[PDB]
RNA sequence: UAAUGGUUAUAUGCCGCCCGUCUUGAAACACGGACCAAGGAGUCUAACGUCUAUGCGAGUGUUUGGGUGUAAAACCCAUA
RNA sequence: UUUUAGUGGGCCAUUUUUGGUAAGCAGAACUGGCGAUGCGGGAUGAACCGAACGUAGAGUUAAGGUGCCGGAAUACACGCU
RNA sequence: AUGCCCUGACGAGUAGGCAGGCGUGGAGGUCAGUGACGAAGCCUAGACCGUAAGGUCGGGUCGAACGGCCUCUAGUGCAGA
């Protein structure tokens, strides 16, 4: 008479709802992901239909990973990088892009390779290399009623829904992508192509944005 | 390698012990470390922390501060909750019937309050009697009031009692402490 | 106790705390209060200011016995009178028979008042007195009484 | 104790995220798209193939 | 020399001190002998107080 | 002998280890500095306002 | 026998032998730290010894464990060997080395009949 | 020797701003200072009494005492590693507002008068500021536009 | 069971300058050291400062002395 | 908030500098280093490049390389000598 | 229960600070400790434990005393002078 059963029973209906809820958003996500992807698409063969250019949102998302070491940094990009949480060579943040990240971006420019990430690397590296903040504690995610206990309040109860305020840039992205504790991302897997890292991207090297093709460098760092 | 922004290896900079070996007072710090886990009442935070204060961080509370903290508005029936020592005092000519949990009492402070009809309380039996801390009241015993504390940052404009063997003419009163002589602080 | 220092600590290691460059030496600063208006007067001043000069006159031959006044205030003034005798007269506040406190027989010189006695009389032999001392006692409906 | 990695682990994967087995079943990730007879306009190709 | 937040002392041991060390070791051996002493003299001046 | 006379070299190195504080504001500054007038009026502003806030609670 | 452990791993059995203790007689074997500001062996440079450090401390579970799987108690009489009777899957007797040559037959003949190893049961035996 | 007095190295900044010699225009005695207003430290070399010191040139600080012609204004200065409060009895002819503190001022009531109009409908009025958001969408016409530069230019040194 | 493993000697590959010291900088063609045993260098005291522990606490401090003793101990005590 | 140790000989590099024809020169500024620091590379080197260090295993890289010493293509391509 | 366990991060270092330990001579207690059937010392490319300071055991030599633990104390640890 302790009664466990008919809480057991209550606890594994409670969970049978809350995968629905999860099972119908990630559904939802799945259908705006494509019709965006088909809007764009279709808003480009239109507008040449019709003369015209179609020019791009342009991105709201880039994802910074930094290429350099720890010794001699000037003092200004040694505390931008602190505020950006790129504390190590190979660790990875998703950055929201405004006019007030921009301009630390330029400060970092030769210790980072940044650009912008596709919805298949931010489902990767959230997979893969998702970690959450919780009493600072470093939690891996593993499982979807730890990412509801601290990300709840924001209506954020699954993997697929931080996946989600991540790739679109959504009211709660600052709370949603704090708790992600910075990438840990090894070295990429087919090296860095490039025989010097440390020239740009644009004469050669690897650092600052290469905007689409960060995700080829990402993948093969994941 | 790591961009380190803070101190690795930090302690907190908090007892989370007394550095005493007294057998009885780490028995009370057993007692008060059960209650704050498993309470949730903040009172036996504060009390178990109070526990492990040092001497001078553990001040005297006289009688005449316990019957003060009485004359609080509604307060007059409240337990009074002293971590230390409560002393005397010959200043205060009536003393109300109260309730005083402390861990010592000196020979006096124990006749004022029984002679009032009050009791004098270990803080077993107060966590016995009040394990939420429920009715109580804490008390503190003044910290600055210490003589070395009139010592602390002695410099130039700041008052604060220079460190000295010897009082009176000829120590310390002259070049440097009036404009006749020298300059003045 | 001599295992506790930090000197069974330093045994392995060169300097024993002292440093290699500063190599402890006899006196580096000189004996003593050596050049503390020279090359020790910011710790002169700052920490000791007052000490170079003189202050006023010279006493030749002082007698501390002379000068002997040990104040006692109202604060207390009752703890002279001994704790079983103090409740009966506390209570029972009167004239007519009010007690007595010998003040110089407790060892006091002068009778300050800090504050705050009960309203009983009592009979003060006192040395010195001082203007609210006087007042308090007499407020309270006592007497100060000068002896010598 | 012991991370496991979606995207191995079909386990881990159907843990995390219901709708991955939809996604495999109606296959989802290599879904066609219609056949739509858009052209571009004459200064459009005119002006790709200028000089 | 001069140093920290420190208390000017006043210790007078720059004679030869150390040939005037008197140390009292025999307290208890002076206050033994000072009771054999009354004793003795009690028994020389007896009855006399 | 001839010697380095001066260089700030490795001074804001020791300027931020300690963390640079800015001076810790409080409401209710010191009165020290302001015009004597001033102030020796503002003991009469704010004593009159506690006899008119005192009596009027009880 | 001893109870089931972990297979035990020692991360450096070589001995750390002090610096220059090959060279010189006065020099012992006995490990001291070169606090020398020159000293290579101090500043790590490759090709020098190994100096020990927290990192190849062992493992808790097989810490102070025998390769037989017991903790080594020093017996030095039979009522100190009865205070492992219980005991007898995680500890082994080590009789003293100044134990009697008669009464290391007497410990020995406890130990045998309470179950007990005794790690060295050869000390003093006319063979 | 070397020299540290107290204009030294003032050359041009005690000047007086090319073809704005003379007296001072009566605008800048007519201006009110009350204790807590934020103000911009100039000096005016034409007035010699109540100039602040080179340091504060430029330094923007709070009144906190208000004498006959004189305001007192409080600057914080970076003495070592820490902060030290500076009490600066300046006449009011090296002093102007700062223009920050009137543009705030007015948001601050422009905020009061945004969550109005929230408290009639619509509540979280989004009244927070927001940095320079990426560009949206666009499609460029050409119409009378068509797109049209040639290459680079060649080399040439037109002397 | 010396089969695995340990130790040890050797061989092979790659690496490895002589320690201590002062110095901005030492393998230096800077100083000390041929070797070994034993000895060998922050101590004690007077007066204090911060901190901490303990006793009592508006007080405190028995041990200068006195009493006592199983006798340099322990125990007890007035006036200062 | 208290208290206290050592230090108070410095040196190098990038950039901007004063003097000097110039200096492995004498003096400044900002930063990063060395001193106080090993590791991979520059054959070798306090300071350069890469990267800072618990003990191990596996993977991937950096700077630098891949005829042989020497791990790694006497690779592919267009020329020049 | 300065225990047992769960979780996360971290680990360079001279001068220097502090903490936790190892060892020596002597002291109070204890183990009714070891010991002429062999104490202590010494030798031992024999064994074991500890990251280490060190601790333990076996063998040989030897011949009278000497250890563990809880504490006290210092003329307490050497490669250099
Ligand atoms: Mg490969
Ligand atoms: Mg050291
Ligand atoms: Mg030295
Ligand atoms: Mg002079
Ligand atoms: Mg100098
Ligand atoms: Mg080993
Ligand atoms: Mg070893
Ligand atoms: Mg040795
Ligand atoms: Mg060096
Ligand atoms: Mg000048
Ligand atoms: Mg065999
Ligand atoms: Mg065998
Ligand atoms: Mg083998
Ligand atoms: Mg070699
Ligand atoms: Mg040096
Ligand atoms: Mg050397
Ligand atoms: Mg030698
Ligand atoms: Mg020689
Ligand atoms: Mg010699
Ligand atoms: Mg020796
Ligand atoms: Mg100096
Ligand atoms: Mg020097
Ligand atoms: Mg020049
Ligand atoms: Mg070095
Ligand atoms: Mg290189
Ligand atoms: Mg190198
Ligand atoms: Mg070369
Ligand atoms: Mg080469
Ligand atoms: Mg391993
Ligand atoms: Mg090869
Ligand atoms: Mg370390
Ligand atoms: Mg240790
Ligand atoms: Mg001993
Ligand atoms: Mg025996
Ligand atoms: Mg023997
Ligand atoms: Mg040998
Ligand atoms: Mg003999
Ligand atoms: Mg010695
Ligand atoms: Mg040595
Ligand atoms: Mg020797
Ligand atoms: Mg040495």
New binding site residues.
Partial sequence: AEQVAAERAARKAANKEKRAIILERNAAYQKEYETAERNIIQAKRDAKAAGSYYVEAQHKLVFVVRI????????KPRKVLQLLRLT??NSGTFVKVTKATLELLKLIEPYVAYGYPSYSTIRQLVYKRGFGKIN?????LSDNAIIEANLGKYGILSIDDLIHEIITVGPHFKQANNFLWPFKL???????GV????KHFIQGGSFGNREEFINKLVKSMN | ??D?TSK??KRSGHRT??????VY?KLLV?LYTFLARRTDAPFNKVVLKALFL????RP?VSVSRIARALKQEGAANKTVVVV??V????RIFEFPKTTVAAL?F????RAKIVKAGGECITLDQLAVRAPKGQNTLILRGPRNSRE?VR???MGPHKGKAP?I?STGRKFERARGRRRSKGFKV | ???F?????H?G????????????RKHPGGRGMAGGQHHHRINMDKYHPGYFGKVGMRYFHKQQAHFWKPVLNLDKLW?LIPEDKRDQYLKSASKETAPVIDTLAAGYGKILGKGRIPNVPVIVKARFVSKLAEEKIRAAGGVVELIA | ?LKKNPLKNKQVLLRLNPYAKVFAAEKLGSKKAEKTGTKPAAVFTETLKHD | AI?????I?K?H?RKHWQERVKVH????????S??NA?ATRAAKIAPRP | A????????????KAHRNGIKKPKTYKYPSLKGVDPKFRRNHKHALHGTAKALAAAKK | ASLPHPK?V???????KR??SDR?????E???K???????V???????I?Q???????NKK??????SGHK?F?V??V?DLETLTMHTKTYAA??????????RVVILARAKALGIKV??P????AL | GKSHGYRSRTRYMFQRDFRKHGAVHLSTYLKVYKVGDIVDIKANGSIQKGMPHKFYQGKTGVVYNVTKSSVGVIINKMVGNRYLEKRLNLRVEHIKHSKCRQEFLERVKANAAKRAEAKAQGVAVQLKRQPAQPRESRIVSTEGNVPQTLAPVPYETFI
């Fill in positions: 350099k070491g720890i010794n001699k940094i000037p003092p190590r060579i600072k504690q470093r939690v891996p090894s070295n990429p897997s087919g090296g860095w025989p010097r890292k440390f | 390698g790591i380190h690795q290896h012990a007394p550095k005493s070996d007294n007072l057993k040092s001497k001078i961080n005297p230390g020592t002393t005397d005092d010959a010592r000196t020979a006096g402070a070395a010592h602390f940052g460190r063997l | 106790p001599s295992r220092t930090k000197t069974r600590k045994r290691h060169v300097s024993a705390g002292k440093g290699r460059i500063g190599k402890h703890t | 104790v | 140093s920290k937040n420190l208390p002392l210790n041991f070791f025999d307290q208890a051996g002076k206050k033994v000072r009771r009354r | 001839k010697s380095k006379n001066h260089t700030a070299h490795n001074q804001t190195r | 035990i020692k991360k450096h059995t070589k001995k750390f610096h220059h010189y007689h006065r020099v012992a006995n490990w001291r070169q606090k020398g500001i020159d000293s290579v101090r500043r790590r440079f490759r090709g020098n190994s020990p450090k927290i990192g190849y401390g062992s097989t810490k102070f464990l025998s390769p080594t020093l030095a009489n009522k080590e009789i003293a080395h100044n134990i009697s040559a008669k009464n790690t060295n050869k000390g003093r035996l």
